């Protein structure tokens, strides 16, 4: 098959940005591209054909331009309704592939993660399983860190996380990390932590609590 | 005006088999591609293949040959889809689309609205809402956090609202992951001030339709 | 602008081959469909091939379906058209024609080129046969089966010009032509050089 | 299959004419655009009107198209002298296995020039053709305008379909235009009946010639 690979995995531009991402062909592909805009909760969107030619009901600062195997789209002047993802579709040889795509983000200045911790309610402490919530609340940019330590060990392979869409008001970001434990197993320890380093943090911060000690 | 309805979500079982439809109106259907295209959650997308609607002949990609079938009824303007053998792996949004007229070479015109499938071995059942307490030690910020979290239920989704939609602004309901037990599981956060923890009641409206179920859970210190 | 310019046909014999070119310039070549329409003599547009931009679709007219190939190089800006055991109502001016964007229902062809001839007759060269026609009253003389164009007639040796008309000719199934002079009021003066024949006839 | 246009069309300069473009339901019947194309005597077909009603650029607003049911028509305004061309409907067609239709095509004559009906003269095989074991029948059409005429042949009263070819129109010097019919019998026939007649047809009006042994 044919390799697209979009080379700005995620991109974060602001409103008036004259913004571009690639698209690379593994092998000669002529102008046989094609592009698609794909907002959240929302179907692919056909923007450019053939590399460059364009699509009636499109603004004009969409545009594409590569040939052979390099290709770029512009949006010369960033809008919010502009924030989605981005996919290149190749139609020289079977099968279709599409690229990795690019995502779109706002950028905005650095904010610090205001970190909680929430221990298991007794109520499901009774059903026999504990879970353990370190919530990340309004954050930017979006990477982060969390570690889980109980009694000052590593734990792994026993949380999942959970990250929101960036928000329409803010711009910022929130997570939240579930560790999930027996209750025989969560009453066998005491401190538990979750570790957070983010880039607004001259340093992680710990947020605690020991086991039925409120 | 082109318009391209799909079939509804389906939730299957594995080992069985499926038929997605997808609607063709307002345009001559004879004679355009109809394209198929898979797309995983927090994935990308995946070219299944294609189908002539005036002629039916296909194109199917190397990996999907022998899981997805094409056809199309002239009569009806509707292209379909039939997956066969299914798998956990097999559940993703599926997209229809008509293609190039004569030449499939021809960009993605005119998308569906796409079909969500989801396929598991799991019954559906109502979840099991438990507290975020805010935390005894509260001054974070003069602002606490607390919660709900809404544990083990199959399918999706469940809505959340907070004091019956009273309660929207600083509300996060996290997207749902998939427990190792092939279960969902999901959390809906909220900050309020730290002055108002004695004085104000918080309760989270959990609802989950395909089980039928309502919970209402208080939380507090 | 957009250039389009066709090459490779000639004559040929009822199943013989021959292979067309369409350089286009003035466009991003690779990003379009191509076609092939042809024109009999005197007739209309018939659709022939048709290629996509990838080369992975090509579509045939039922007529030629199992004679023809269609191609095209994309590096060479090039489009080609294979013709094998050519009959004689594959005569015809075979045009180059892009197909062009549309919204939708089937789009045009927005640019054609100049064409190329294509002729398939057999027939060799042979010496016309002229009989009088027998009559202000009309006289005149027929020239039958020849080929090929021209063939030139006078009456009186060029003197008599007032009233003569000499009708085109007609090509028959044969392949040969035929055609026709007469004139209002007699020797004729028929000439065909290619086969080195000149008759003189009297009505 | 092809779509159904008037063989020729005529309209005095400034006038405005129609040319008509019928097809069926697996064509312009099922829903394709119609598309028209302009052909100058030896030049390529050029594109006239796309997507039923469009102009492309350098079209001026005399040309207009609109399509409805299974037809097509293409309207022209203030008929000018450069008008003088082939016009060509064209649709794509479900049927077989899918194929580009064109329109038979129509030749649109500016009148400068009052009508003519075509002057038929025929002649009867030579007496020096039958004792080659020959006989051609020569119907000479001069005269006429538009440039445009039908020709049949009539043995007796029955018609003739066999041996029949017809040349083109041809313009003379004086801007009419003439043409030509052969038909090619054998000695026998030509004997075996009591007449054969030539019968050319100019727009409404029939001009007829007869010869007889």
């Known amino acids: 098959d044919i390799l697209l690979t979009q080379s700005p995995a995620i991109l974060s531009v602001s409103p008036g940005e004259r913004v571009s991402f690639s698209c690379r062909a593994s092998?000669?592909?002529?102008?046989?591209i094609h592009w698609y805009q794909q907002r959240t909760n929302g179907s692919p969107r056909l923007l450019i054909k053939?590399?460059?030619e364009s699509i009636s009901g499109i603004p004009s600062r969409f545009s594409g331009s590569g040939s052979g195997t390099d290709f770029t789209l512009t949006i010369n002047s960033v809008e919010s309704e502009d924030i989605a993802d981005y996919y290149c579709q190749q139609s020289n040889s079977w099968p279709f592939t599409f690229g990795s795509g690019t995502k779109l983000e706002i950028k905005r200045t650095v904010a610090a993660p205001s970190v909680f911790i929430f221990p298991p309610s007794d109520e499901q402490l009774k059903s026999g399983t504990a879970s353990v919530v370190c919530l990340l609340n309004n954050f930017y940019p979006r990477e982060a860190k969390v570690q889980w330590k109980v009694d000052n060990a590593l734990q792994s392979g026993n949380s999942q996380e959970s990250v929101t869409e960036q928000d329409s008001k803010d711009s910022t970001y929130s997570l939240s990390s579930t560790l999930t434990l027996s209750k025989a197993d969560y009453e066998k320890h005491k401190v538990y932590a979750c570790e957070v380093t983010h880039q607004g943090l001259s340093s992680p911060v710990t947020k605690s609590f020991n086991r039925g000690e409120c | 005006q082109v318009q391209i309805q799909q079939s509804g979500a389906e939730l299957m079982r594995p080992g069985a088999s499926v038929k997605l439809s997808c609607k063709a109106t307002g345009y001559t259907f004879t004679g355009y591609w109809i394209e198929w295209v898979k797309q995983r959650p927090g994935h990308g997308l995946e070219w299944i293949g294609e189908?002539?609607?005036?002629?039916?002949?296909?194109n199917y990609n190397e990996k999907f040959k022998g899981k997805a079938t094409f056809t199309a009824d002239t009569y009806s303007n509707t292209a379909y889809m039939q997956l066969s053998s299914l798998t956990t792996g097999d559940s993703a949004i599926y997209y229809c689309?008509?293609?190039?007229?004569?030449?499939?070479?021809?960009?993605?015109?005119?998308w569906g609205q796409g079909t969500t499938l989801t396929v598991s071995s799991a019954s559906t059942k109502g979840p099991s809402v438990f507290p975020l307490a805010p935390s005894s030690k509260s001054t974070s910020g003069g602002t606490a956090a607390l919660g709900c979290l809404v544990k083990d239920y199959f399918p999706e989704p469940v809505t959340v609202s907070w004091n019956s939609g009273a309660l929207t602004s600083g509300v996060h309901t996290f997207p749902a992951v998939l427990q190792s037990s092939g279960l969902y599981s999901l959390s809906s956060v909220v900050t309020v001030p730290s002055s108002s923890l004695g004085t104000q009641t918080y309760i989270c409206n959990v609802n989950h339709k395909p089980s039928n179920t309502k919970v209402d859970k208080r939380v507090e210190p | 602008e957009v250039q389009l310019v066709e090459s490779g046909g000639g004559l040929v014999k009822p199943g013989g081959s021959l292979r067309l070119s369409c350089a286009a310039s003035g466009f991003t070549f690779s990003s379009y469909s191509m076609n092939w329409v042809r024109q009999a003599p005197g007739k209309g547009l018939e659709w022939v091939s048709s290629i996509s931009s990838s080369s992975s679709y090509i579509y045939y007219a039922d007529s030629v379906k199992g004679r023809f190939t269609i191609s095209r190089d994309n590096a060479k800006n090039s489009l080609y058209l294979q013709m094998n055991s050519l009959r004689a109502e594959d005569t015809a001016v075979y045009y180059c024609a892009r197909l062009g964007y549309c919204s939708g229902g089937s789009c045009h062809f927005d640019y054609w080129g100049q064409g190329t001839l294509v002729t398939v007759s057999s027939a060799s060269t042979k010496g016309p046969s002229v009989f009088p026609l027998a009559p202000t009253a009309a006289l005149g003389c027929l020239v039958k089966d020849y080929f090929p164009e021209p063939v030139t007639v006078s009456w009186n040796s060029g003197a008599l010009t007032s009233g003569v008309h000499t009708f085109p000719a007609v090509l028959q199934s044969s392949g040969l032509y035929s055609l026709s002079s007469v004139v209002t009021v007699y020797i004729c003066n028929v000439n065909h050089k290619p086969s080195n024949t000149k008759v003189d006839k009297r009505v | 299959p092809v779509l159904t246009q008037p063989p020729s069309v005529s309209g005095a300069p400034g006038q405005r004419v129609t040319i008509s473009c019928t097809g069926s339901s697996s064509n312009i019947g099922a829903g394709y655009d119609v598309h028209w194309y302009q052909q100058l005597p030896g030049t390529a077909p050029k594109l006239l009107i796309y997507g039923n009603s469009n102009r492309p650029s350098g079209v001026p607003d005399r040309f207009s198209g609109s399509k409805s049911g299974t037809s097509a028509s293409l309207a022209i305004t203030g008929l000018q002298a450069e008008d003088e061309a082939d016009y060509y409907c064209q649709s794509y067609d479900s049927s077989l296995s899918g194929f580009y239709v064109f329109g038979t095509g129509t030749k649109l004559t500016v009148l400068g020039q009052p009508k003519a009906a075509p002057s038929v003269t025929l002649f009867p095989p030579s007496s020096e053709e039958l004792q080659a074991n020959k006989a051609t029948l020569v119907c000479l059409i001069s005269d006429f305008y538009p440039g445009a005429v039908t020709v049949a042949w009539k043995a007796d009263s029955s018609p003739v379909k066999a041996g029949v070819e017809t040349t083109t129109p041809s313009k003379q010097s004086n801007n009419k235009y003439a043409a030509s019919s052969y038909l090619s019998l054998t000695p026998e026939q030509w004997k075996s009946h009591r007449s054969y007649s030539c019968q050319v047809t100019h727009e409404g009006s029939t001009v007829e010639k007869t010869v007889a042994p």
């Open positions: 689309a008509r293609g190039g007229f004569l030449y499939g070479d021809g960009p993605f015109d005119y």
């Open positions: 053939y590399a460059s």
């Open positions: 189908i002539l609607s005036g002629r039916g002949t296909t």
């Open positions: 092998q000669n592909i002529d102008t046989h």
